[PDB]
Structures are given as structure tokens and as C-alpha cells.
Write a protein that holds these residues in place. Sequence first.
Motif, PDB file in Angstrom:
ATOM      1  N   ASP A  23      -7.064  16.616  -4.194  1.00 44.46           N
ATOM      2  CA  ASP A  23      -7.134  15.449  -5.077  1.00 44.46           C
ATOM      3  C   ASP A  23      -6.096  14.364  -4.723  1.00 44.46           C
ATOM      4  O   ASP A  23      -5.135  14.621  -3.992  1.00 44.46           O
ATOM      5  CB  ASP A  23      -7.013  15.868  -6.552  1.00 44.46           C
ATOM      6  N   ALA A  24      -6.303  13.161  -5.260  1.00 47.24           N
ATOM      7  CA  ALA A  24      -5.541  11.952  -4.894  1.00 47.24           C
ATOM      8  C   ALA A  24      -4.015  12.093  -4.850  1.00 47.24           C
ATOM      9  O   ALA A  24      -3.382  12.390  -5.866  1.00 47.24           O
ATOM     10  CB  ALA A  24      -5.932  10.779  -5.819  1.00 47.24           C
ATOM     11  N   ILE A  25      -3.428  11.848  -3.680  1.00 44.87           N
ATOM     12  CA  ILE A  25      -1.970  11.773  -3.568  1.00 44.87           C
ATOM     13  C   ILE A  25      -1.507  10.420  -3.016  1.00 44.87           C
ATOM     14  O   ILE A  25      -1.982   9.978  -1.972  1.00 44.87           O
ATOM     15  CB  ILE A  25      -1.408  12.911  -2.703  1.00 44.87           C
ATOM     16  N   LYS A  26      -0.588   9.767  -3.724  1.00 44.20           N
ATOM     17  CA  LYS A  26      -0.138   8.408  -3.369  1.00 44.20           C
ATOM     18  C   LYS A  26       1.106   8.425  -2.475  1.00 44.20           C
ATOM     19  O   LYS A  26       2.125   9.035  -2.815  1.00 44.20           O
ATOM     20  CB  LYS A  26       0.141   7.582  -4.628  1.00 44.20           C
ATOM     21  N   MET A  27       1.022   7.756  -1.329  1.00 37.51           N
ATOM     22  CA  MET A  27       2.124   7.757  -0.369  1.00 37.51           C
ATOM     23  C   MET A  27       2.763   6.383  -0.244  1.00 37.51           C
ATOM     24  O   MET A  27       2.068   5.371  -0.141  1.00 37.51           O
ATOM     25  CB  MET A  27       1.639   8.224   1.001  1.00 37.51           C
ATOM     26  N   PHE A  28       4.088   6.348  -0.274  1.00 34.51           N
ATOM     27  CA  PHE A  28       4.799   5.132   0.069  1.00 34.51           C
ATOM     28  C   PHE A  28       4.924   5.038   1.582  1.00 34.51           C
ATOM     29  O   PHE A  28       5.197   6.030   2.249  1.00 34.51           O
ATOM     30  CB  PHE A  28       6.188   5.096  -0.553  1.00 34.51           C
ATOM     31  N   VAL A  29       4.726   3.845   2.126  1.00 39.17           N
ATOM     32  CA  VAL A  29       4.853   3.649   3.571  1.00 39.17           C
ATOM     33  C   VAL A  29       5.670   2.396   3.869  1.00 39.17           C
ATOM     34  O   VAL A  29       5.329   1.305   3.416  1.00 39.17           O
ATOM     35  CB  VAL A  29       3.462   3.586   4.262  1.00 39.17           C
ATOM     36  N   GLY A  30       6.754   2.567   4.615  1.00 42.19           N
ATOM     37  CA  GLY A  30       7.666   1.477   4.906  1.00 42.19           C
ATOM     38  C   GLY A  30       7.717   1.197   6.388  1.00 42.19           C
ATOM     39  O   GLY A  30       7.106   1.912   7.172  1.00 42.19           O
ATOM     40  N   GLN A  31       8.440   0.153   6.772  1.00 44.66           N
ATOM     41  CA  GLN A  31       8.559  -0.244   8.179  1.00 44.66           C
ATOM     42  C   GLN A  31       7.236  -0.683   8.773  1.00 44.66           C
ATOM     43  O   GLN A  31       6.855  -0.237   9.845  1.00 44.66           O
ATOM     44  CB  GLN A  31       9.160   0.879   9.014  1.00 44.66           C
ATOM     45  N   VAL A  32       6.551  -1.571   8.070  1.00 45.15           N
ATOM     46  CA  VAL A  32       5.256  -2.097   8.488  1.00 45.15           C
ATOM     47  C   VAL A  32       5.353  -3.616   8.713  1.00 45.15           C
ATOM     48  O   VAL A  32       5.964  -4.322   7.918  1.00 45.15           O
ATOM     49  CB  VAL A  32       4.196  -1.771   7.414  1.00 45.15           C
ATOM     50  N   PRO A  33       4.772  -4.121   9.812  1.00 45.39           N
ATOM     51  CA  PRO A  33       4.879  -5.542  10.165  1.00 45.39           C
ATOM     52  C   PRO A  33       4.293  -6.449   9.082  1.00 45.39           C
ATOM     53  O   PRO A  33       3.269  -6.111   8.485  1.00 45.39           O
ATOM     54  CB  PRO A  33       4.034  -5.646  11.436  1.00 45.39           C
ATOM     55  N   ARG A  34       4.919  -7.596   8.847  1.00 44.08           N
ATOM     56  CA  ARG A  34       4.518  -8.469   7.744  1.00 44.08           C
ATOM     57  C   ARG A  34       3.186  -9.168   7.982  1.00 44.08           C
ATOM     58  O   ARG A  34       2.662  -9.819   7.079  1.00 44.08           O
ATOM     59  CB  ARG A  34       5.595  -9.510   7.440  1.00 44.08           C
ATOM     60  N   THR A  35       2.646  -9.039   9.188  1.00 43.55           N
ATOM     61  CA  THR A  35       1.370  -9.649   9.527  1.00 43.55           C
ATOM     62  C   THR A  35       0.215  -8.718   9.228  1.00 43.55           C
ATOM     63  O   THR A  35      -0.921  -9.159   9.073  1.00 43.55           O
ATOM     64  CB  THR A  35       1.303 -10.005  11.005  1.00 43.55           C
ATOM     65  N   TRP A  36       0.502  -7.426   9.154  1.00 41.28           N
ATOM     66  CA  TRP A  36      -0.517  -6.445   8.820  1.00 41.28           C
ATOM     67  C   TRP A  36      -1.006  -6.570   7.371  1.00 41.28           C
ATOM     68  O   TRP A  36      -0.217  -6.694   6.429  1.00 41.28           O
ATOM     69  CB  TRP A  36       0.011  -5.042   9.066  1.00 41.28           C
ATOM     70  N   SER A  37      -2.319  -6.518   7.208  1.00 42.69           N
ATOM     71  CA  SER A  37      -2.934  -6.604   5.903  1.00 42.69           C
ATOM     72  C   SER A  37      -3.472  -5.236   5.493  1.00 42.69           C
ATOM     73  O   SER A  37      -3.377  -4.285   6.249  1.00 42.69           O
ATOM     74  CB  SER A  37      -4.075  -7.596   5.971  1.00 42.69           C
ATOM     75  N   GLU A  38      -4.021  -5.145   4.290  1.00 39.55           N
ATOM     76  CA  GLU A  38      -4.654  -3.928   3.820  1.00 39.55           C
ATOM     77  C   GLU A  38      -5.593  -3.367   4.877  1.00 39.55           C
ATOM     78  O   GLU A  38      -5.574  -2.172   5.157  1.00 39.55           O
ATOM     79  CB  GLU A  38      -5.438  -4.187   2.523  1.00 39.55           C
ATOM     80  N   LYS A  39      -6.409  -4.234   5.470  1.00 36.60           N
ATOM     81  CA  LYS A  39      -7.457  -3.787   6.386  1.00 36.60           C
ATOM     82  C   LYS A  39      -6.919  -3.210   7.695  1.00 36.60           C
ATOM     83  O   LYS A  39      -7.506  -2.282   8.246  1.00 36.60           O
ATOM     84  CB  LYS A  39      -8.454  -4.912   6.682  1.00 36.60           C
ATOM     85  N   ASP A  40      -5.821  -3.769   8.192  1.00 37.33           N
ATOM     86  CA  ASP A  40      -5.165  -3.245   9.380  1.00 37.33           C
ATOM     87  C   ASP A  40      -4.568  -1.885   9.078  1.00 37.33           C
ATOM     88  O   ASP A  40      -4.535  -1.001   9.928  1.00 37.33           O
ATOM     89  CB  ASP A  40      -4.042  -4.179   9.824  1.00 37.33           C
ATOM     90  N   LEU A  41      -4.071  -1.738   7.858  1.00 42.42           N
ATOM     91  CA  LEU A  41      -3.438  -0.506   7.436  1.00 42.42           C
ATOM     92  C   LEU A  41      -4.481   0.571   7.228  1.00 42.42           C
ATOM     93  O   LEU A  41      -4.303   1.693   7.642  1.00 42.42           O
ATOM     94  CB  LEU A  41      -2.633  -0.752   6.164  1.00 42.42           C
ATOM     95  N   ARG A  42      -5.577   0.211   6.577  1.00 40.07           N
ATOM     96  CA  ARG A  42      -6.687   1.125   6.378  1.00 40.07           C
ATOM     97  C   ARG A  42      -7.233   1.645   7.701  1.00 40.07           C
ATOM     98  O   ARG A  42      -7.738   2.770   7.776  1.00 40.07           O
ATOM     99  CB  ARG A  42      -7.811   0.437   5.632  1.00 40.07           C
ATOM    100  N   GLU A  43      -7.152   0.812   8.736  1.00 39.65           N
ATOM    101  CA  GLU A  43      -7.655   1.186  10.049  1.00 39.65           C
ATOM    102  C   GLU A  43      -6.775   2.291  10.560  1.00 39.65           C
ATOM    103  O   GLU A  43      -7.243   3.237  11.185  1.00 39.65           O
ATOM    104  CB  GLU A  43      -7.568   0.013  11.010  1.00 39.65           C
ATOM    105  N   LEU A  44      -5.489   2.159  10.267  1.00 45.49           N
ATOM    106  CA  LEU A  44      -4.489   3.113  10.710  1.00 45.49           C
ATOM    107  C   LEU A  44      -4.596   4.461   9.985  1.00 45.49           C
ATOM    108  O   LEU A  44      -4.634   5.505  10.627  1.00 45.49           O
ATOM    109  CB  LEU A  44      -3.091   2.513  10.547  1.00 45.49           C
ATOM    110  N   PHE A  45      -4.668   4.441   8.660  1.00 48.18           N
ATOM    111  CA  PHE A  45      -4.661   5.679   7.889  1.00 48.18           C
ATOM    112  C   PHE A  45      -6.001   6.392   7.880  1.00 48.18           C
ATOM    113  O   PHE A  45      -6.045   7.611   7.743  1.00 48.18           O
ATOM    114  CB  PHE A  45      -4.207   5.440   6.437  1.00 48.18           C
ATOM    115  N   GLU A  46      -7.087   5.633   8.002  1.00 50.48           N
ATOM    116  CA  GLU A  46      -8.434   6.199   7.939  1.00 50.48           C
ATOM    117  C   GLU A  46      -8.733   7.192   9.053  1.00 50.48           C
ATOM    118  O   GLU A  46      -9.711   7.929   8.976  1.00 50.48           O
ATOM    119  CB  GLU A  46      -9.486   5.099   7.978  1.00 50.48           C
ATOM    120  N   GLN A  47      -7.908   7.197  10.093  1.00 48.82           N
ATOM    121  CA  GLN A  47      -8.043   8.177  11.160  1.00 48.82           C
ATOM    122  C   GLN A  47      -7.823   9.583  10.642  1.00 48.82           C
ATOM    123  O   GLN A  47      -8.361  10.541  11.202  1.00 48.82           O
ATOM    124  CB  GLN A  47      -7.009   7.928  12.244  1.00 48.82           C
ATOM    125  N   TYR A  48      -7.016   9.701   9.586  1.00 52.21           N
ATOM    126  CA  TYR A  48      -6.566  10.997   9.069  1.00 52.21           C
ATOM    127  C   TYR A  48      -7.393  11.469   7.888  1.00 52.21           C
ATOM    128  O   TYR A  48      -7.236  12.597   7.411  1.00 52.21           O
ATOM    129  CB  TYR A  48      -5.081  10.938   8.677  1.00 52.21           C
TER     130      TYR A  48
END
Lengths: 86, 85
Positions: free
Chosen positions: B1-26
Motif C-alpha cells: 500500500d501507498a508509501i510517501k517518499m521525500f526526494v531531495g537534490q533534484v535539478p530546478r528545471t525538472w518537473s513532475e513529468k521528468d520525475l515520474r519518468e525517473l521513478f516509474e522505472q521502479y
Amino acid sequence: DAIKMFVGQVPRTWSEKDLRELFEQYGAVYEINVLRDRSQNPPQSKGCCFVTFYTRKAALEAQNALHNMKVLPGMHHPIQMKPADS
Amino acid sequence: DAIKMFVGQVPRTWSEKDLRELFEQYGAVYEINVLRDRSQNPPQSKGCCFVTFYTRKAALEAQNALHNMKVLPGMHHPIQMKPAD
RNA sequence: UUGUUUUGUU
């Protein structure tokens, strides 16, 4: 020669510009950095800053004139000013 | 079930969609919130985010693979990823 | 709440 000074007891509403007008009465100022808590929107002042003068003469003149000498509006203690640890 | 993760050290140009591309691999990602300085205009990214996975297996695999492992492009530190407070 | 910033948890 340039020397980097720590300044404290500055009001959180003061920006780099406000501070530059303060220190420039003493000599040219190369750079002012307000220390901020980046977790706020916008980042809050931590009530202190770093200021570098082009000369050690200016920095001393300022330290003499300010440290424990002057209290900024709304503050409860006089400016603390001294060579930054760095 | 749903677990919320904090993620830091991310470039300020990255948007939700760039991030989703990254995490969706897992695994499937339920939500991504880029923390923004809305006082700015445009609102400006704070370089971290919250990401919610549908399953804890995906979150732990992402965490294991990312926290302190990967340095996103342009950054001076490795991603910080732990369960959000 | 004297604070020496860039680690940011809406």
C-alpha cells in the motif's frame, strides 16, 4: 586587502540592498550575503549576513562604528560584527 | 500500500513529468509533488519533491537504487530519498 | 530566535 566579516542582529526584513546602504558609509563593499533558511517561502533571513569590504581599513572602521554600538530598528541587541570564521 | 517518499537534490528545471519518468522505472507512481516557492513568479522549484508509490516494494527498490547512489545531472550531491515525515 | 547559509519534508 579584502576581508570577509560576519554581521549579526540584523532584522529579518532587511535585504542585501538595505544592508549595503548601511555598510557603504564605511567603504566600498564587494559582496553582501544575507544568510537564509531556504525551507521558507521565500527563504527567511536568519538575522545575520556576510559582508566583504575591498579594504581592511573599511572593515575595521565599520566594526568599530557598529559592533555593540548600534541597535537596528526592532532588534533587542546591538550588531555583532567580526571576522567571519570561514 | 501507498508509501510517501521525500526526494531531495533534484535539478530546478525538472518537473513532475521528468520525475515520474525517473521513478516509474521502479513501479507505478501515484503522485508527485514538486515543492515550489509560490511567492516567486513563475513559482520556482525547491529542488526536492514528494513521490508516492502504490506499493512499498517499489518505494524500497527506488530508495535502494537512488538514495546516495545517483547524482542527477548538474547536482553537487546524490539524491536523498527516505520515507516522508 | 547569539543566527557563521545553499539538506530543500507541501
